[PDB]
Symmetry: C2
Subunit: 109 residues, 2 copies
Amino acid sequence: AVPNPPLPAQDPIVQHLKLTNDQITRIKKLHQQLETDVSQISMKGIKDGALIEVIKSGKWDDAAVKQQLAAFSNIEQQARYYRVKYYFDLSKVLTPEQRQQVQQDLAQA
Amino acid sequence: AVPNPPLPAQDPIVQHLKLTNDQITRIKKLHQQLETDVSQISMGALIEVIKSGKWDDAAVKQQLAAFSNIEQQARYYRVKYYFDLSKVLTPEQRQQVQQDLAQAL
Ligand code: NA
């Protein structure tokens, strides 16, 4: 699973790079946009505590569980799309050496 | 989403329940079944776009869809595990687990 990117000041993948302030400025803007984008993903699909209720009731509800998990799936697919695009866009401001570093750190995850 | 459950002795969800040996034995069996079931879920482009520097939208979406398809199935079994686990518990223990899981979402 693509990682949920920390703030660049907190992200070990970017902290490991010796980035110029211009590079950091650009990556910060990218991460800001990432958070803006993911914050717009609709979460209305999730019902608060749909799974706990099934467990609490003692009666298995195949349809309800599948629906809730499908809703989680849909949201995560979208969030991860933007997380992947972030690291892709991030790589564009890097040197070839820095880029190979990121690719290695990401493949590991 | 849904916790990926450790064995009972390591699972924070059930560590304060004061499970008996018979309860542990049965829950360990459920956990063994969970792992077997998850293992039988039929299981790249994300790295290639970074390496090539060329965005492949469809490839990225395809891989993410495949991964989420797996996760949906695995999480189904994980929810079922806690559901089945709860049957082994006393009413008080069940009440605790429900509250622990609700706290974990
Ligand atoms: Na672009």
